[PDB]
Symmetry: C4
């Protein structure tokens, strides 16, 4: 009844406060933020940038036109040649700035060979133009390609279960791929979250404790086509070792599950997460099979993914008791 540190969607429930350097540290990493903001903001931002360069140069050109005396003779004649043809005022100067930076260049307003400063400005503005474009491309490219989007076609079981496999008592949860694209170099991790006090009397607000999914033997690496059921064998070195079915409806703790892997197309690691509270773990259940064979191939029924069935055959005590008891019977 304490609270949820990671929601079921993987979303983490926490907030940072009194971060001192936040503004100056965010300026240096500035690109990283820019790509996480809503599109409309990233866009409006860029159109803001465009608009600003158009107005700036537009003004310069208008200033030049004003001083040269072009405003009064925009088209020139035999005895007089303007800096930029057909700039009669502000809006005209604005239009030419846009036409130039965008490279539309209708040509009705046009630079002449007269002013080196007008020429120069055109030069500068062109270069400027490319620069802004380049940033926009990259930004869009980057944001467009974010691998965290892939985590939404990855799936966790609504519950985790505990049950026997091959003589061992195991915590299990299930994972699945909702795309026919592969998750490359995928692997998993699990952790038990809960506050604790060390024998020295040190309070750890939330301690994160590894749940061994087979990392040592290289078994945490998975090949995920059909849903895989992930197994934690509860043993001497397990944090759940002394926990029984009744300890599940009493205790407060949380199990955090991770799936890391690479989006096949971009080879960019995505990390998917979810969470099981002690009250979301079903003791004595087993997952319903989603895979079955038909004729020339295999199929997965995904409506059975979350479903579990009761195994009355399941022991209600902790692995600890289970073990210790084995050594009474076997001891006498």
């Amino acid at each position: 009844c304490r609270n949820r540190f990671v929601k079921k969607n993987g979303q983490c429930n926490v907030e940072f406060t009194n971060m001192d350097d936040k503004p100056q540290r965010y300026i240096a990493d500035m690109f990283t933020t820019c790509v996480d903001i809503r599109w409309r903001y990233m866009l409006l931002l860029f159109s803001l940038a465009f608009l600003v360069s158009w107005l700036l140069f537009g003004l310069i050109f208008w200033l030049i036109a004003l001083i040269h005396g072009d405003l009064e003779n925009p088209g020139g004649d035999d005895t007089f040649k303007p800096c930029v043809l057909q700039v009669n005022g502000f809006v005209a100067a604005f239009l030419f700035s846009i036409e130039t930076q965008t490279t539309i260049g209708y040509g009705f307003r046009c630079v002449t060979e007269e002013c080196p400063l007008a020429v120069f400005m055109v030069v500068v503005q062109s270069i400027v133009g490319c620069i802004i474009d380049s940033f926009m491309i990259g930004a869009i490219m980057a944001k467009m390609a974010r691998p965290k989007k892939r985590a939404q076609t990855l799936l966790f079981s609504h519950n985790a279960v505990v049950a026997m496999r091959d003589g061992k008592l195991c915590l299990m949860w299930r994972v699945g791929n909702l795309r026919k694209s592969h998750l490359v170099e995928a692997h998993v991790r699990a952790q038990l979250i809960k506050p604790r006090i060390t024998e020295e009397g040190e309070y750890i607000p939330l301690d994160q404790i590894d749940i061994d999914v087979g990392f040592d033997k290289g078994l945490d690496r998975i090949f995920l086509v059909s849903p895989i059921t992930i197994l934690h064998e509860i043993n001497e070195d397990s944090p759940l070792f002394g926990i029984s079915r009744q300890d599940l409806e009493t205790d407060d703790f949380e199990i955090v599950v991770i799936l890391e892997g690479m989006v096949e197309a971009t080879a960019m690691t995505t990390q998917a997460r979810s969470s099981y509270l002690a009250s979301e773990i079903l003791w004595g259940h087993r997952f319903e099979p989603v895979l079955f064979e038909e004729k020339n191939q295999y199929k997965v029924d995904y409506s059975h993914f979350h479903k579990t069935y009761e195994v009355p055959s399941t022991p209600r005590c902790s692995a600890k008791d289970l073990v210790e008891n084995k050594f009474l019977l076997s001891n006498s």
Copy 2:
């Protein structure tokens, strides 16, 4: 005689059904799909987008021209200035929209300083223009660069063999690189696939079982220039431990082989796969050498890659028997 879970090309034989959230989960990951569809579709899609913005703006301009009364005086005179010169109708309005968004800007149809709304629209459309381009670039860039294409210059042997190496009985298959480019940080994995029932009576439609290629000792990492022969030593902890040559023509199971590595040029992980059925494994054979030395260098003959030869010297029983028997003789 059951069926093949992964084809020989690496293609997986399975299909997902009754996935509930598929539409809304695919919208969030939408970029990931977009790059896997056939070119013509991704392209037609984008030309569809272009076409749509040209028509949309074209319409706006035509509406503006209509209301301003430009349709009747497209070129204007001393007493009258149009919003956009030379828009006499729909097609004219269309052309200007394209000329503008594409930045061709022939200039025959041209914005004037008269309408702020025409100007604004031009502004908006330009910005819009960049945006669509940017998406196209990224999409093409991404799709163009997909690392899974590299898996087609990587190679597996048509068969796997079992045979003795240095006193040990080993399952072996071969892998090869068809490019002179390196596969960076490459490593392998193998798995035995087959359905099973746990001693608790739990049916696992297909259980995936690790075949140890040396992960523990860091030996699953390979340096692949010439074809490497991959070895699984069949021992106490091997899933093939109790399997003999006769069990091979009887049993139904499958071995799945993986090669993961990085495309040298892009450093993007590609994953190559293939499969050996118990009936594709040749007991008592050995691979033909594809590498030989000549003068100033080494050469690889790839026509010998798949070829195997008989070793009548090979034991036909399981590693299990082989071991157990050693301990009769050595026991008496």
Copy 3:
């Protein structure tokens, strides 16, 4: 009192000298440098490139105009057609070159069907134009996206502490994430730096010695949301094994701490670093908790991140003594 090999910001304090091949080796890797230089330099560089192609082609066109005799008849008539209309001199030839390469193409200066060489040149220059753009985009894209920028939203504690946890004496330092974005596949490393002489009398100017953070058990991998305290248990195989609280104010050595992980958005590994001198390590202290629970969620107070408190309960001798002593008492 020797010196600092890595500053606290992670910056390494060292310089390379008498590198022989530096110029020719840097030319081959040239792209890598280009993206690390200040913007203004990368930009000025590119505008330098632009400017150079505009002048080059501008000259060609002017040469062509000169020879054709266009300088004297820029607009032509019934009996004479220029190579490029309206090029009356250098600046005119310059303007057309820019208009062409930038694709502004106002159109006042325009190629005609007369000179195949003018046409060809236009062809060449256009192609050239794209090429330079493409480089600029990539450069900007690349530099824009550098993952090392992310290391500035990652955090280390100003000090490291030594203290007891669960019956063991541990060196600890703390790490934190200043963004709500995740650090994917993150893990840590630590090293003791100091010069030494092997029993063979070989001097190692600075030897780098692994500080075990749990790599073997897969515990060096972390899930970083709230600040994690990193623990080195000082034991038989620890380089700090024979060090006590008094050895800390005497000895000269340095501990180097690393955090490697992936920027969530780009999946590009960043590496963060910092350093603790023996004089920056606080013996007998403990970190102040930055995480606390409120109602519907958790919060982190970052002003407590660096803060430590005294634990007078802490032993002042080395793990070595501590152990050895245990085996007097337990031995008698």
Copy 4:
């Protein structure tokens, strides 16, 4: 005296022959090749593509102009409007095609509202135009960014040495970073190459044998600022175990050394290689220190990198003898 499998530059000495599917497998991976070819080829290729689309469309337009009867009335009048203004022939049709696809759009040749087919063609060509650009960008971007270029600022010692460290006999070679940029998540690998015959009489043309650099303890991971000396301790499980100083001037084999790591700026793994023949290994030597301290910092003299000095104190027998002998003395 056999031959070198990897040259000292890392270049591998081998060639593939009789690869059967080479053309069709290379078509699918086609992008991968495109980026490894010389610039001039990738460029000429693209200019080839451009040129081809300009000519193609140019022809279409000319065909349209021909049929419409524009060739005879390029500028039109009150009673007649051309498809595209000012196309009088082939070259004119060519110019307009280029002006259109490049978006220069001088405007002297210009589409009119008359032909829907001309309009359509313009539409199509524009779209086409973007597509080719996009490919070019990506290609240039990709090729520009190749991480294998970084391997040229990474360094190996010209020789490897064997010598005692802390009571153990070790094969050592040295590695170095020629840039002030870091090599992220770097690690090493080594291998002994030589042909062999298994006790079963199976010939392995070249067997690749792991040289343990500490992978098991996680010590193959390095932090490379100053040059690191890499150590292989020659022990029971070492392939060099039974090799002595005299076996070095006799035997033929090769040691292959690898350094894998990530370019700091792009986080793209590069793999550096080199090789030591038994005749390139200096028994009884030690590397000259390249690092020294001065005042406020550290410096590296790179001219000392390759240099080694004699240690007459060094044993000339194999680790094997060395060990076995220890157990005579200690045995009697």
